[PDB]
Design a protein around this nucleic acid. Structure first.
Ligand SMILES: [Mg+2]
Ligand SMILES: [Mg+2]
Ligand SMILES: [Zn+2]
Ligand SMILES: [Zn+2]
Lengths: 98, 55, 67, 170
RNA sequence: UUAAAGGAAUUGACGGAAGGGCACCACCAGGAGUGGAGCCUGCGGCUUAAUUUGACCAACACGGGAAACCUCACCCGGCCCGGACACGGACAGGAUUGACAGAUUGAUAGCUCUUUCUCGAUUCCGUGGGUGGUGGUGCAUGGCCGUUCUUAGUUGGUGGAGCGAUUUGUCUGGUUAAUUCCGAUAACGAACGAGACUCUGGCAUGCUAACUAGUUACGCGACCCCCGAGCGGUCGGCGUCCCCCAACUUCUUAGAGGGACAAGUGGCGUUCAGCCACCCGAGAUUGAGCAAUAACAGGUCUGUGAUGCCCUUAGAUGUCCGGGGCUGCACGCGCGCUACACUGACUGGCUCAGCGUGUGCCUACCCUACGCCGGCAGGCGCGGGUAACCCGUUGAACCCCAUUCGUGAUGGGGAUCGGGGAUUGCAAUUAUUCCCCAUGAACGAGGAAUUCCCAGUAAGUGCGGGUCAUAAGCUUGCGUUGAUUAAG
């Protein structure tokens, strides 16, 4: 899209602390509810996750009006390199509940 | 873009703002009881809502 | 089907390939040539504009008088 | 905040119930979904799936529940610690119509003859202890004009109220 | 010159062919009408920059489509990219964002331009490839729906008949709303539809239970009262689960069970099914839902991240914004409102309902009591209600009683049109609606033709949902008043 560097790390850090993010199909909403703190319009939330599909890192289902997304493991080894994270940090995907 | 007047017409009162939560249409939708579904849309899920017919 | 009026181009920028905003004498000298912006943020940081007479803070869109 | 009226309590939970039924159709169709059933409590609320292949909905130490616990949680306004999922096997896989309608979907995606494939699921319900079943396959079969082939077997009612609970449609 | 022409049988469809049945989407007997008038609204036509469009019993108040803009496609213009990825280039010694000012616009669109500051790999460019579409194709489809089709109809198994398509089962007859039953019988046993069923309505002074329903009794308060009493009369005035300063369920709301089966009794009928009468009874046919087999080249790709294929993809059919149109009128048609008056219209009294809906995740805005301003719409202050808790005991209209008017296009009728006042809204002009004064048009019961209906029915009369910021002449529900005709 236009891809500001502050908001991409703002959406990736939640998209890596859990393996999901739950945007809704309306571009005319200037406030994503689950971030709600760095004045993202969810254009940036859409058009990031468009790019994550085309590399094959994320997955999506298109509910009634909601997009759901999921982390493939090739996305996790992509986000642990792009967020510069050491190879012990894993999301709530693998085993965080017993 | 040029955000001052991209989406500047007021989507407020009137059928330029009501939409189907389920189908994404603006025509014929039912705003009774806070449903906001498309009328064509309403028939599918009406058994799942809990709306029975006469039998 | 025709489009007679020719909407002419997109926006391609000015493409001026030199910075050079600090003149130097006497073997090393700090000297401004454009005014700095009087905002709360960029004192002696990002410049204020140098028009033929007036000055304008480019980042936060405040302006000086036409003089 | 302020709570809304009992008329619009009961259409909110139904459209809660209708919404996740539509998503969990889209996700678990390749894993034999066959419905959900909800429990609202003033605690953790407990949502149980009725999947046939409960092996496939479980991830490696249960990944594909825990992200599917979250997409319900991070949409329908549940705080951290109020909603959970359970996978449960439906008894008689070949007796609820939602189950094997998706089975003969993914039999048709294997490139089978439609007449050979529909017989085997027609045979599957009737040998599973049913009272009657019929399958209508309608669309563009071999031919340019579309046509429908029905494969009725057994006996089956059509009218009155007892076609509400003696039958299930898919 | 030509690939059939023909013969016999079978199944349908049709017959201005018989026979038996049946339906107010059929008639009779009728009622109310519609068609005539003004207007409201859809359709054709014309006109247009555009008047976007889909549909011709089973299109035409239909797309729940009552469009100020948005919707929104169509027309005149003007921005934006929300063109993912993949490759090459551009690419720290100079890729790309944003923006004050001015001729520049319709526009405080850096749209562009003159000039110059600013943004930090984000992108930009070429080439492939996505993607979006209220773009095409409902004759490429799914799903849904309409219909032939509200009528009784449909199909196997196994036997019987035929070379066979097929047929018997599924019928002479009686009977039924009904292949409904009784019987007759190369059929026997079954299935579906019909029916049962579910919802609903009518009855239970019997059962259960009520400060979010009530009565009744009893306290209190007020008021009348021959005359002056009161266990007198009235009171939706107050209290009696407020910690007993009463009981109870008739009325109200349900829940369970009851109740009606053609049972009883005559008559008819093969004394078979059943029919016709009655008595008891609340009721001796309440009303609707679902609803088969096989089909329609029915409708809908403009309802849908249901979808194939094609088209188009940046000077974009994407999307946003400003205006305009969908309302334009020599005419024709279809739903419908108000009427043509005295069985009325006014004016003032008077007393009666039921179904239901009400403050929202996004999403702003709800129903309104009461008080005080206004001659009216309305304007404020102040409450209550997320509801058997408040509006509300929903003082609905017609009807009823007194008044005025007198057969005159009249005080019938209220179209048209001028001036004003308010509300909704970003905006009321091509009048949103409402209010006030004034203006006072056809219209005297409507030719041929044609529609719906037979009991709380037709019809009159209002009321509430939907649409809804503003709003109903439409629809879908309610009660009220209530029939004339008919059992063919
Ligand atoms: Mg659609
Ligand atoms: Mg007269
Ligand atoms: Zn500053
Ligand atoms: Zn096309």
């Amino acid at each position: 899209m236009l891809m500001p560097k502050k908001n991409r790390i703002a959406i990736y850090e939640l998209l890596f602390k859990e393996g999901v993010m739950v945007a809704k199909k309306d571009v005319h909403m200037p406030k994503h509810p689950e971030l709600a703190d760095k004045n993202v319009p969810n254009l940036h939330v859409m058009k990031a996750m468009q790019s994550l599909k085309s590399r094959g890192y994320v997955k999506e289902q298109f509910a009634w009006r909601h997009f759901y997304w999921y982390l493939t493991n090739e996305g996790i080894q992509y986000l642990r390199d792009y967020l510069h994270l050491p190879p012990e940090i894993v999301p709530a995907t693998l085993r965080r509940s017993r | 873009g040029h955000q001052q007047l991209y989406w500047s017409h007021p989507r407020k009162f009137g059928q330029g703002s009501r939409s189907c939560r389920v189908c994404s249409n603006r025509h014929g939708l039912i705003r009774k009881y806070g449903l906001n579904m498309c009328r064509q849309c309403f028939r599918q899920y009406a058994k799942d809502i809990g709306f029975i017919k006469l039998d | 089907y025709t489009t007679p009026k020719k909407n002419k181009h997109k926006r391609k920028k000015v493409k001026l390939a030199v910075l050079k905003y600090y003149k130097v004498d006497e073997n090393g000298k700090i000297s401004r040539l454009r005014r700095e912006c009087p905002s709360d943020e960029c004192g002696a940081g990002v410049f204020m504009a140098s028009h033929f007479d007036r000055h304008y803070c480019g980042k936060c869109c405040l302006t000086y008088c036409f003089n | 905040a302020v709570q809304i009226s009992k008329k619009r309590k009961f259409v909110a939970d139904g459209i809660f119930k209708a919404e996740l039924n539509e998503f969990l159709t889209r996700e678990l169709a390749e894993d034999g979904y066959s419905g959900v059933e909800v429990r609202v409590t003033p605690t953790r609320t407990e949502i149980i799936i009725l999947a046939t292949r409960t092996q496939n909905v479980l991830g490696e130490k249960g990944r594909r529940i825990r992200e599917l616990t979250a997409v319900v949680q991070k949409r329908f306004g549940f705080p951290e610690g109020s909603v959970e999922l359970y996978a449960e096997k439906v008894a008689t896989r070949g007796l609820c119509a939602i189950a094997q309608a998706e089975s003969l979907r993914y039999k048709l995606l294997g490139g089978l003859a439609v007449r050979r494939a529909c017989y085997g699921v027609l045979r599957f319900i009737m040998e599973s202890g049913a009272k009657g079943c019929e399958v209508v396959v309608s669309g563009k079969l071999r031919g340019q004009r579309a046509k429908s082939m029905k494969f009725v077997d057994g006996l089956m009612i059509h009218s009155g109220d007892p076609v509400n609970y003696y039958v299930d449609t898919a």
